Amino acid sequence: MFKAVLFDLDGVITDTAEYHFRAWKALAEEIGINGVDRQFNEQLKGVSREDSLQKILDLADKKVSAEEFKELAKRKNDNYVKMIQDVSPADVYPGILQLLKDLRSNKIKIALASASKNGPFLLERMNLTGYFDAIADPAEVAASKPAPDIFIAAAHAVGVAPSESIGLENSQAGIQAIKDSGALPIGVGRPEDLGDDIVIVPDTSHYTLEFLKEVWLQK
């Protein structure tokens, strides 16, 4: 039987992408740049804070000093941190609290494998801290998704190998990272995005202990 489940945060436990988008849009309005919409925002996902800002400036060929650039970037982060003060237990995705309860009661380890610099804080705001055995620190990995480093780190932190683990993700890069770690992926989304060679469920309500056990047996 699998010994651990490795969770991403965004797209699995809750939505942080909406708050990043609102913070970038507010920044662009402040500096007078048009075109930061949700389609455009697809180009900012999984990209560094600095590269995202540059893509926004390039919409208007807008030049700023190195100083101004550093401070516009920090300003957007400050706004994002303000916005997530309102996250609550009601923001947890369907199925996820019941899964955490069932994993804990069956002595299966629970770890976070997220790029979020605010993971510990967000789990505290959602009242989930007491379910998690470890949180991998994204500041300590040498390579980001699709590299396997953050999934290796999450597994190791709870005393298991990835090969003993299931990983849950909604992104192409995260699924590849789980695959290359040695863990078993179960995606949430559609195979058109995530692949034909893994099990995929259409939404998080399908993530049940019974289903995870079925997928592990059949792998």
Site for Na ion in 67-106 (CB under 5 A): none
Residue where the block lists tokens 């979020």: 116
Residue nearest to Na ion (CB): 11
Site for Na ion in 153-212 (CB under 5 A): 170-171
- Answer yes or no: are the C-beta atoms of 2 and 178 closer than 8 Å: no
**51 part of the active site:** no
**180 part of the active site:** no
**Please, what is the minimum distance in Å from the beta carbon of residue 68 to Na ion?**
32
149 binds Na ion (CB under 5 A): no
Q: CA–CA distance from 41 to each of 64, 90, 115, 171, 211 (Å)?
A: 21, 25, 18, 15, 34
Residue where the block lists tokens 């034909």: 196
11 binds Na ion (CB under 5 A): yes
Residue type for position 191? P
Beta carbons within 8 Å of 52's beta carbon, 6+ residues apart: 24, 44
**Please, what is the minimum distance in Å from the beta carbon of residue 7 to Na ion?**
9
10 binds Na ion (CB under 5 A): yes
Residue type for position 158? V
Pick the stretch among 8-16, 77-85, 122-130, 136-144 that binds Na ion (CB under 5 A). Answer: 8-16
116 binds Na ion (CB under 5 A): no
Of the candidate residues 8, 24, 100, 145, the single one contacting Na ion (CB under 5 A): 8
Buried b or exposed e, range 1-18, using 16+ CB within 10 angstroms: ebbbbbbbbbbbbbebee
**What are the residues binding Na ion (CB under 5 A)?**
8, 10-11, 170-171
Mind telling me the catalytic residues? Answer: 8, 10
